[PDB]
Amino acid sequence: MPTLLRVYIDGPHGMGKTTTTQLLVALDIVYVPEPMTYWRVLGASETIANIYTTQHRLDQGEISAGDAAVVMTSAQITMGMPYAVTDAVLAPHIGGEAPPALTLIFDRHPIAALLCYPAARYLMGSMTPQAVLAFVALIPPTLPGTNIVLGALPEDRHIDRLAKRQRPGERLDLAMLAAIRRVYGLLANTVRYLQCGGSWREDWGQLAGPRPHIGDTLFTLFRAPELLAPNGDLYNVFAWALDVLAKRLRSMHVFILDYDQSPAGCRDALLQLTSGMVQTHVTTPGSIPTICDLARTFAREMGE
Amino acid sequence: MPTLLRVYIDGPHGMGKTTTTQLLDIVYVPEPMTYWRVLGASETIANIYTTQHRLDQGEISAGDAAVVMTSAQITMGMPYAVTDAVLAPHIGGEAPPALTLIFDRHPIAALLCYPAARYLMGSMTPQAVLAFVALIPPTLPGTNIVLGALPEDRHIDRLAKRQRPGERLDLAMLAAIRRVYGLLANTVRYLQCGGSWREDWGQLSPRPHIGDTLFTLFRAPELLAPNGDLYNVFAWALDVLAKRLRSMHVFILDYDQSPAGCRDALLQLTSGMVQTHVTTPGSIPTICDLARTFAREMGE
Ligand SMILES: O=c1[nH]c(Nc2ccccc2)nc2c1ncn2CCCCO
Ligand SMILES: O=c1[nH]c(Nc2ccccc2)nc2c1ncn2CCCCO
Secondary structure (H helix, E strand, O other): OOEEEEEEEEOOOOOOHHHHHHHHHOOOEEEEOOOHHHHHHHOOOOHHHHHHHHHHHHHOOOOOHHHHHHHHHHHHHHHHHHHHHHHHHHHHHEEEEOOOOEEEEEEOOHHHHHHHHHHHHHHOOOOOHHHHHHHHHOOOOOOOOOEEEEEEOOHHHHHHHHOOOOOOOOOOOHHHHHHHHHHHHHHHHHHHHHHOOOOHHHHHHHOOOOOOOHHHOHHHHHOOHHHEOOOOOEOHHHHHHHHHHHHHHOOOEEEEEEOOOOHHHHHHHHHHHHHHOOOEEEOOOOHHHHHHHHHHHHHHHHOO | OOEEEEEEEOOOOOOOHHHHHOOOOEEEEOOOHHHHHHHOOOOHHHHHHHHHHHHHOOOOOHHHHHHHHHHHHHHHHHHHHHHHHHHHHHEEEEOOOOEEEEEEOOHHHHHHHHHHHHHOOOOOOHHHHHHHHHOOOOOOOOOEEEEEEOOHHHHHHHHHHOOOOOOOOOHHHHHHHHHHHHHHHHHHHHHHOOOOHHHHHHHHOOOOOHHHOHHHHHOOHHHEOOOOOEOHHHHHHHHHHHHHHHOOEEEEEEOOOOHHHHHHHHHHHHHHOOOEEEOOOOHHHHHHHHHHHHHHHHOO
């Protein structure tokens, strides 16, 4: 059976990620863009604009935390829908791990919708930690060959960039920018932590390269009063969601891409990272064409 | 590897499922009432019924209602998602069972049936509904679902006898939900006899007619392009639904009888349920601990 190379470029918004995925493709390679048309029209009306307004009305003391949460949470569901459908449709085509016959470059991974942004909004106070763990419990099983590229960019440059690379409905909120950057840095450490054999349950009381301190992983965000029982321990339901989190992240192949450079520099840097990435076989011979069409149809219908 | 038997008692609420299950190498995992009332959020059922009421009364709009209603389904289904997640690794291939697990509801009640009924009640968008559908976990081997049977008025009698905290006796919601489970049963038989929704879709414009399956609910205007075509994103979500439901094993329990009988009935259906092996030697004890701990912590 032919082989497939899947690469999900992810990380905080505003680093020039979407531009370099396109440059890469401009060079048997297909792109799955951000489903902007779904966010703007098909799933709901101006979801991004709705998200920024709600957070703003919250920070302004114009709505309550509960009003904000109800709105922020439903908005997250609309944002992640195209990501879940894509994963569920692609799943039965992915075979065991292995020039690929096909290279699929995705603009973000389901965890951006089911973990990272919801965690950042929790930090921003417009979502509850229980809702964040409900999304995490729904993260789909990690398929073989899940290569994820996370980006790095100094904060001052990112700030400067953001004042440029905004989004229709987006308001420049640097508290949110800081939150999302911290959430993705914790993600990176968590994968490291897990692959070095870390056990969050063993290290709970304590709340490439060497094994990170659990306090430097995502597990640290879930030490909130709402999830702790009278005896000070986490309720079993919340703890099992962390077991799920650990299970999902430990089989992923994470890489860091430096965005503090020109678009062409980023493309070439990503191109070399692409050599040491895990491929998989496809489950059937006609998987490649079928997969080619899914990406192109998704792109055509939702790219914007 | 020892064998396990999972049984998910599902269907519209208020038919006597727990009355029968509590009269029943076998653990029972109750519904997560404490999570709904306290752990996940404060009084989730009250919030759900109050919001619909307000919308019914015109005190709020369809959009305000949808945001609150959708957000609440997330709290309602959480314990079911984690449970399926943590259990999945232990389930082996199709196979007296070492253990029998009687679950109070399957994730599809939370990620498909209730959201669908709420859409049918005007307080949930069909796009939000297909997002929950897209997240339904893969159907593990040996997934046996028991659905209820009961004439509407006896069901209304039964419902009146057991309101949950914050619930308001809504006959429109009772019909919506009954409709959804009826369609659900027809949908499984449709898929099992070889039905292809994409092929039978035009009909909306030996197996049940697609008009009597869950597919008919998604011929909703919000999901269609100007030419009437379903957008591919939604079509892909319908492909997932078809995939998840076809491999389920459905069993019908007549509730229109006595608790002794209903309970007797449940035990008889057990003979045609499919068993599976567990994945490790230590799977049985761990699955046992999981069930007792879920019950102890979230069963009220
Ligand atoms: O609250 C938020 N949720 C999500 N979810 C999300 C889901 C899938 C892919 C990308 C983002 N994204 C947010 C939010 N605020 C700003 N953004 C970034 C918006 C621009 C993403 O291009
Ligand atoms: O909007 C609703 N959503 C759900 N979701 C739900 C989630 C998991 C298990 C059962 C139901 N349940 C609802 C709703 N209204 C009434 N009920 C019934 C509550 C009592 C179930 O016995």
